[PDB]
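Incident log, entry 3
Record: Fanconi anemia group I protein homolog (1134 residues)
Problem: checksum mismatch between cached and fresh output.
Input:
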Amino acid sequence: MDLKILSLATDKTTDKLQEFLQTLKDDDLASLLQNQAVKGRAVGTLLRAVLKGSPCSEEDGALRRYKIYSCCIQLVESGDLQQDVASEIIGLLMLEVHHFPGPLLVDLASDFVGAVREDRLVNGKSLELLPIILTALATKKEVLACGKGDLNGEEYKRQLIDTLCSVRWPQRYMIQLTSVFKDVCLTPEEMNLVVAKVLTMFSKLNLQEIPPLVYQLLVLSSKGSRRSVLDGIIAFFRELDKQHREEQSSTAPADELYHVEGTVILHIVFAIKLDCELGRELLKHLKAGQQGDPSKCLCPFSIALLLSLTRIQRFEEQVFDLLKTSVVKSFKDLQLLQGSKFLQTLVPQRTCVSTMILEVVRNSVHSWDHVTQGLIEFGFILMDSYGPKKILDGSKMTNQHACKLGANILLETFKIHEMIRQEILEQVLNRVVTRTSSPINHFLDLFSDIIMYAPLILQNCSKVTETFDYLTFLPLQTVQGLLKAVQPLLKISMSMRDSLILVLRKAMFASQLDARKSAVAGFLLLLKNFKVLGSLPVTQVRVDVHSRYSAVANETFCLEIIDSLKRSLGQQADIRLMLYDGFYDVLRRNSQLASSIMQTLFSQLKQFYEPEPDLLPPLKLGACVLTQGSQIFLQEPLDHLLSCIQHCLAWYKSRVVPEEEEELYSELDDMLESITVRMIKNTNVGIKNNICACLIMGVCEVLMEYNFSISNFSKSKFEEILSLFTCYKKFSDILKVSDSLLSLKFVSDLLTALFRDSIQSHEESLSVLRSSGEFMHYAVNVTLQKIQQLIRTGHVSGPDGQNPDKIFQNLCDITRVLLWRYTSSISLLCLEGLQKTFSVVLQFYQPKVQQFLQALDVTVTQRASFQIRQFQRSLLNLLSSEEDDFNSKEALLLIAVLSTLSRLLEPTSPQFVQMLSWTSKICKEYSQEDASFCKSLMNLFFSLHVLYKSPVTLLRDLSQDIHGQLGDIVVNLRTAAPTVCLLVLSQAEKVLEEVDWLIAKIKGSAPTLLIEKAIVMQLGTLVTFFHELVQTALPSGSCVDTLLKGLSKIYSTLTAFVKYYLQVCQSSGIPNTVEKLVKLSGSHLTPVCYSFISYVQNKSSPIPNLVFAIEQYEKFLIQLSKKSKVNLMQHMKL
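Fresh output:
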């Protein structure tokens, strides 16, 4: 057998070879099976002769090969044969398949697809043939003899694959199956066929098997259809995530799901490394553009992918823009959706990219390192780009929200990942110490939060300590923020504390003022946190007890600082003031310092106080002014020195009651009274005088505060208090804002004492005051004036001035007292002050809103509608009994209180309706001739309304009024003409921006109709609105121009709606909705517009922007009508 085939190969073709074949016909099965079992290399050349013994020139040759090929295949898979034998066989089979005719290849490949149905091959090595078979097929474009011939080599190869995809691939070989398509050239349809079929399997595999498959899928994309490969993987995991996240609302999977996702992400980033198109495609795909997409575009998974893709340099800048710009879009849209009811009806709420990226951080816990570097780096880009800027140098909602998300990413990453903890910190600090005048405050806040989170990590932190060396070189605002935030570390690390002391010790010696001003802030801060235990008889820390570990702090620690600080009292006035403020804060926290601080304050007054009883200028105000070389400065703001000594004394008496102190506090009490009685009695010369004036004004304002808190009882002291105001007012007339020296706690107490407090024995208390009556609204002027100053900055003059809890308290105290007076001219001020209160509480203290409303007596919305009722009732009262000309001022700010409060009302709410409908009532049933009042009532009306239904009812109706009461060439002539004109125009313009966004939204999709018909009804009611105005005469000054701008906008909106249908009807019918209202423009608008422009030129003796708009509007109607269906444009001219 064997040997006799060896001659045929060395003899010649045909006769020798082919004849022996026809002789056998029986078993090439039993022969080949056992011939490899004997020797595999004797079988190795067994084919080469037999294959050249059966060419395609003869059928018995060709139709014979088909049997051999099927036997080789059968053995390779079933047999246990060694891989050298196995791979030698398919080596030959692959290299001899070249010349097989079209009919046979189809049969061979269909035998594979046949195997695919159900087989245990254990070998895909059989499948390695498939690629060579399918390609050899496509080579021949000629019909082949099979069945109905009718088909080229390309089509049988397409239908073969087509079937391979419809048959089920077994779980075992499917990897090898997909690596088979690796070598086979494909059509885009064949690609998307193989791809989308491989995807259908993902949901059927145990999770740990996907990463290798995804790898095997991605190698196909390289030749293939990138977008669909990616979109598939992404879409699969996005959905998978969705389910897991709903399991979270009701660790278990998290290990697997996210570890796999990481590996999968790690796999596709790896591909993007080898093939850039893959990357450029991932970006092209994910890129937002029109905003309907970026909501469905980005998901936590794809974002994590993008962030891990960051590691490949070239893609970094791009990944960040995509994310950066999507964070803004995501927000700015949701910011819009909350603004209009109609948008809510058409568009459902969407998880915003913000909370998505945060979920990436959250999910990053499980083995995603590759994702962190890009994470922290992105968080910074937000804080960098969106941080506050020009506020330091003489809708930012997005700017803020972006910047905060930058911080949140950064904070939360820090919490979750130990390994980057240091780099985050170093990165924050290095900006703080290194960055310009450019405001760093947002960075200090994060620094504060990181520390506050776990002070234990950074207790050592030389990187914090090393920061202190720049303490003098940094702006005071920074140094305070740095120190304040760094506190929890100081209480822990001794070496950091001692190092700060040593730094501050010599900071005090800096010639530069600002340097010393910092050094002081530092020591003052130290004193707040540090005790001694000394030689003695919020729980600060004892610096003294460890003497082996502290080379700096001793028992002298507290006094050592006070002495160091004493020297600043002889320095610039600006510093002394800062030291006065500090002394009080410090005294309150440290009891032992009472003597040392008081001593210092005492001996300071001694310089400015004339001891000789009754030399009528009881304080020497000449020494408060220094003059060097043509310039007169005030040093030592005496009025604060007094306030400080006042608040300390008040404290010492108040608090410490558990000797040389009692002699101090008596002698100062003596001095204050002495000053009390004796006190009631441009160009350099005058520049000094003006200072002294408001010095006294303060001094009196301080003595007022003191003599009150001295005793709240006697008529005799209130007689002085009035006389002290009589001195203050005296100079105040002779000539003032934040200058109130009254501590806010006092401004609270006395306003609560004056109005609410009667039940106390003395009516003479009130009367000595009420009867002056200028003092009455002066005391209401300080409060109203400090609340205002409280919205300019966050601070307030005196003690507990920056304490946000003490401020909130004082706000609650003051508010309900102003409410008592307004339920019952001073009563006007109370409202004005009452107004500023609410506005502050809401835009600063917002989370405390619930607390706030309680002090005044769904539950939050309850308190709101309760207060609203009381106000809306006294507005109605002002109107119902209104006498001729009454108040444009009280009616104005009474509405302001309502508008402020109405923002607390839930947009759904039963209570919200009470406010909206009530407002709608005042609009119909009233009018008045002061423009101030209507614009407010309208804004409030609109404000509430647009959260109910689209305004296009009010709009169309409001125009019918102005249109009727003006022109054609309840609000009256003086009302609606200049004012209520501009409002409906502005309001409608916004309603157009809405439509514009809707219109652009639908275009971007490449439930839809439900919106389109709402867009029509929206635009339809709006055309009716403008027609009223375009008819009517309006004052030529402004409203003319505003109506023009508003008009050209509709034409741009309609044009946008038009070229949208130019797009949508390329894939087409333009239903009655569209049509009917298209010519409703060319009837009610177009002609009426042309007539309005002539009104302007005939009266008068921007403009071109209206015509171009109408022209372009028609230019695309001409293109629309022609290229789609209807002659409507020809019906617009009729």
